[PDB]
Amino acid sequence: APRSVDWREKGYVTPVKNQGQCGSCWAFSATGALEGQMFRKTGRLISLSEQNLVDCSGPQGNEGCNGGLMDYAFQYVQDNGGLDSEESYPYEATEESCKYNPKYSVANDTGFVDIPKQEKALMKAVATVGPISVAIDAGHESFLFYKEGIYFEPDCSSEDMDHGVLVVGYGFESTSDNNKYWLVKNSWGEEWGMGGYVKMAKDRRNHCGIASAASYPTV
Ligand SMILES: *C(=N)C1(NC(=O)[C@@H]2C[C@@H](S(O)(O)c3ccc(OC)cc3Cl)CN2C(=O)C2(c3ccc(Cl)cn3)CNC2)CC1
Numbered sequence: 001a002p003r004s005v006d007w008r009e010k011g012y013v014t015p016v017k018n019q020g021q022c023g024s025c026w027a028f029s030a031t032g033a034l035e036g037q038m039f040r041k042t043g044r045l046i047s048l049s050e051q052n053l054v055d056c057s058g059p060q061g062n063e064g065c066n067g068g069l070m071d072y073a074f075q076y077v078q079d080n081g082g083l084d085s086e087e088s089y090p091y092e093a094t095e096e097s098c099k100y101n102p103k104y105s106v107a108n109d110t111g112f113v114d115i116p117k118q119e120k121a122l123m124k125a126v127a128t129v130g131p132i133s134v135a136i137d138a139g140h141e142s143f144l145f146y147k148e149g150i151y152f153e154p155d156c157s158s159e160d161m162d163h164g165v166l167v168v169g170y171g172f173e174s175t176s177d178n179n180k181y182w183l184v185k186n187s188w189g190e191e192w193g194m195g196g197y198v199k200m201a202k203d204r205r206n207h208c209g210i211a212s213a214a215s216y217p218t219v
Contacts, residue, residue: 001123001124001126001127001128002127003171003172004169004170004171004172005126005127005169005170005171006168006169006171006183007036007126007130007131007168007169008168008169011039011045012035012036012039012040012045012130012131012168013032013035013036013045013131013166013168013185014032014035014045014047015190016185016186016187016189016190016195016196016197017047017050017091017187017189018187018188018189019050019093019187019188020093021093022054022064022065022093022094022095023063023064023065023066023067023068024050024053024054024064024065024068024093024187025163025164025165025187026062026067026068026069026070026072026073026164027050027053027054027062027068027073028050028164028165028166028187029070029073029133029134029164029165029166029187030053030070030073030074030133030164030217031047031048031049031050031053031073031083032131032133032166032168032185033070033074033130033131033132033133033166033215033216033217034048034074034077034083034107034109034217034219035047035048035107035131036130036131036168036216037109037129037130037216037217037218037219038106038107038219039130040130040219041219046085046086046106046107047085047086047087048083048084048085048086048106048107049083049084049085049086049088049089049090049091050086050091051089051090051091051092051096052083052084052089052098052099052100053068053073053076053083054095054096055095055096055097055098055099055100056076056080056098056100057072057073057075057076059076059079060072060073060075060076060079062076064095065093065094065095068164069164070112070133070135070164070215071112071114071215074109074111074112074215074217075111075112077107077108077109077217078108078109078110078111080100081102081105081108082100082102082105082106082107082108083105083106083107083108084100084101084104084105084106085104085106088101088104089101089104107219108219109217109218109219110217110218110219111217111218112215112216112217112218113125113215113216113218114213114214114215115132115211115214115215115216117206117211117212117213117214118206118211119202119203119206119210119211121211121214122134122167122182122210122211122214123170125214125216126167126169126170126182129216130216131166131167131168131185131216132166132167132214132215132216133164133165133166133214133215133216134164134165134166134167134184134210134211134213134214135161135162135163135164135209135210135212135213135214136161136162136163136165136184136200136208136209136210137153137156137157137158137160137161137162137163137208137209138161138162138163138165138208139160139162139163140153140155140156143198146192146193146198147193147194148193148194149173149199150173150178150179150181150199150200150201151198151199151200151201151208152178152201152204152207153207153208156207156208156209157208157209158205158206158207158208158209158212159209159212160209161208161209161212161213165184165185165186165187166184166185167182167183167184167185167210167214168183168184168185168197169182169183170182170183170202171183173199178201178204180201180202180203181199181200181201181202182199182200182201182202182210183197183199184197184198184199184200184210185197186198
């Protein structure tokens with residue numbers, strides 16, 4: 001694998017979005033990963049509808065603004081035979097009746113891959129696939145108020161994750177002793193972290209569980 005990867009540079013990643021007060025992180029993580037895979041397939045970067053996922057993926061196990069799983073989202077897209085664009089089905093930050101319209105479907109998937117639960121495996125996937133959906137322990141105030149640099153939280157759990165985000169690359173700071181990171185796109189808007197991104201500690205015993213529940217859709 002390369003020493004550093006950043007899929008934003010290659011056109012795989014849409015601008016940072018903002019889930020608001022709805023517990024829809026899982027939907028943003030899932031659209032992120034699917035946006036990347038669709039871009040690889042077609043060469044077209046098209047923002048996808050989180051609202052479509054929030055409103056419609058109940059049968060697959062998702063619970064709207066009260067939480068969900070990226071894999072349940074990928075299963076929905078496969079079951080449903082499509083997913084609408086952001087433009088056609090805009091984000092409301094509240095759970096509403098399903099308004100899926102197949103005329104405006106711009107993405108599909110044929111299942112998903114769960115990555116082995118090691119950072120080495122995660123690195124190989126990011127290098128070869130594109131952006132990857134991941135679960136992290138975001139349940140510390142240090143994360144909420146993160147601004148810049150490599151995020152390390154001594155109390156982070158590698159087993160107990162509560163927030164779905166998107167790994168878009170990895171790399172290292174040229175500064176000192178702990179300098180590797182995962183480049184992670186959050187869904188809390190551009191004013192959180194580094195333009196909506198966080199550089200998370202990499203190769204430090206699966207910090208915050210970043211490799212514990214990593215997956216992406218097949219297209
Ligand atoms: C996001 N705004 C928020 N968090 C979730 O919905 C969160 C997303 C996933 S992950 O990424 O936390 C996750 C945790 C564990 C595992 O496998 C062990 C995989 C994943 Cl992807 C799940 N989330 C949850 O909050 C839970 C959940 C799961 C499933 C459903 Cl239908 C509802 N909630 C609660 N325990 C996992 C804050 C809402």
